[PDB]
Amino acid sequence: AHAEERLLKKLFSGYNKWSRPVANISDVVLVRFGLSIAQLIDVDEKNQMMTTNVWVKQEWHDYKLRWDPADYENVTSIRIPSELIWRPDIVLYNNADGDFAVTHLTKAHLFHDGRVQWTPPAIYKSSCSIDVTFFPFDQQNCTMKFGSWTYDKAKIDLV
């Protein structure tokens, strides 16, 4: 716990959250992006919206958050606030009456090799076109478009 305070003091001593965490400019940050649906809250046919509860599973490597476990009483991983670190700005392009980015900001699971795991919850209201030709036997196909807003492929790449 004194190591953890020492660890957190060490990691955030000279950390800059506004700069992409790459040791080399030409490097590209790989973001492993995956969804986990909790419940399909609503499918508003009249407004052609879909409200879903998901866990936006993200994972990227931050080269400035690495430490040797042997030097810190063998700390393998720690939980750090997500508002203190640089997180990719993945937004829902086809949003409708909802939030573009993830707003909860739960803590992230940081490992000793720089890997960061972040799985915040979210409630997204995405617009999807609804066909009611065979209602009430219809089959809707509603999509969500996720991508980094500011960073292009040469800087942030999704997996």
Ligand X SMILES: *[C@@H]1O[C@H](CO)[C@@H](O)[C@H](O)[C@H]1NC(C)=O
Ligand Y SMILES: CC(=O)OCC[N+](C)(C)C
Which stretch, 18-26, 127-135, 138-146, 147-155, contacts its own copies (CB under 8 A)?
A: 18-26
Which of 73, 113, 131, 138 touches its own copies by CB under 8 A? 73
Chain breaks in the chain (C to N over 2.5 A) after: none
Which of 30, 71, 104, 145 touches its own copies by CB under 8 A? 104
E-strand ranges in the chain read 29-31, 34-44, 49-66, 77-80, 90-92, 108-111, 113-118, 121-127, 146-148, 156-158
For the segment 5-24, give every residue that binds ligand X (CB under 6 A): 24
Report if residue 51 touches its own copies, rule: CB under 8 A.
Answer: yes
For the segment 119-158, give every residue that binds ligand Y (CB under 6 A): 149-150
Contacts of 156 (CB under 8 A, 6+ apart): 20, 28, 29, 31, 88, 148
Please report, as ranges, the residues that interact with its own copies according to CB under 8 A: 1, 4-5, 8-9, 14, 16, 18-25, 38-39, 41-42, 47, 51, 53, 63-64, 73, 75, 79-81, 84, 89, 91, 93-97, 100-101, 104, 106-107, 121, 123
